[PDB]
Amino acid sequence: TDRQIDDQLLNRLRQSLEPHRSGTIPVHLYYQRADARARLRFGATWRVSPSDRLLNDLRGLIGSEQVELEFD
Amino acid sequence: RKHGREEISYPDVQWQHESLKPVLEPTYGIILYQEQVMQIAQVLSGYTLGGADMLRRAMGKKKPEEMAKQRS
Amino acid sequence: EKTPELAAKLAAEAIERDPWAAQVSQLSLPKLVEQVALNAWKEESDNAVCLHLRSSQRHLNNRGAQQKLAEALSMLKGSTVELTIVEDDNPAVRTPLEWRQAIYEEKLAQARESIIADNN
Incomplete structure (x- = not known):
């Protein structure tokens, strides 16, 4: 969302992800802007486990595991 | 033809006439209905409504003799 | 694309700047004929209106549209506008499209830039 606290950006959200890496799935970030789509692919490191969907839906953000655009 | 992707004709690029516009208006110059067949015989060629229905009937049967007369 | 919110908001600014875009929205044309009025810029003379349509969309422009456009322009003007659609692709003025x-x-x-600068 437009509302990203600061902390959420760098702390809670990050900490949820930090323990669960596996199953190499490239990490991209979609910042849904009102304006446009800006695409910064994080890919700093984390490749996520599957169970994280449910845990990630836990905090302020609804998303999905979609067909990856990158792969094709 | 509905969404401006092709020139609208009444009904064809060469073989069209503006007197067919009131008849073909609803369908953007496309011959869709049995009733349009009948309106064309009325408007274009001065048929009675009942003689127009007789033309449509004769076009269903597709007989050799029968068309020859109405064609005239 | 995308979002109809943004496109209609964006249209509000277009209307807020262009007298023709404003006029078109006031006439409220339906669809195909609207797209003709939209892909053309409205030059206006003492008693004439010649809508310079982008020849890029010449295939939209038909007399069946011109006459409905003319009735609408006439309703706007409150008097008979000789509305014609002419085909000159020169970009010197902007259409509401x-x-x-x-x-x-x-x-x-x-x-x-603001998003890049949020930091993290």
């Missing part, structure tokens, strides 16, 4: 896009592009750029 062409009008929408530029501001959106600029706004995108500025706000991309």
Whole structure:
């Protein structure tokens, strides 16, 4: 969302992800802007486990595991 | 033809006439209905409504003799 | 694309700047004929209106549209407008279609900068 606290950006959200890496799935970030789509692919490191969907839906953000655009 | 992707004709690029516009208006110059067949015989060629229905009937049967007369 | 909110908001700015875009929205044309009025810029003379349509969309422009456009322009003017559609692709003035896009592009750029600058 437009509302990203600061902390959420760098702390809670990050900490949820930090323990669960596996199953190499490239990490991209979609910042849904009102304006446009800006695409910064994080890919700093984390490749996520599957169970994280449910845990990630836990905090302020609804998303999905979609067909990856990158792969094709 | 509905969404401006092709020139609208009444009904064809060469073989069209503006007197067919009131008849073909609803369908953007496309011959869709049995009733349009009948309106064309009325408007274009001065048929009675009942003689127009007789033309449509004769076009269903597709007989050799029968068309020859109405064609005239 | 995308979002109809943004495109209609963007149309509001177009209307807020262009007398023709405003006029078209006041006439409220339906669809195909609207797209003809939209892809053309409205030059206006003492008793004439010649809508310079982008020849890029010449295939939209038909007399069946011109006459409905003419009735609408006449309803606007309150008197008989000799409305014609002419086919000259020269870009010297912007149509209400062409009008929408530029501001959106600029706004995108500025706000991309704000997003990049949120930090983290």
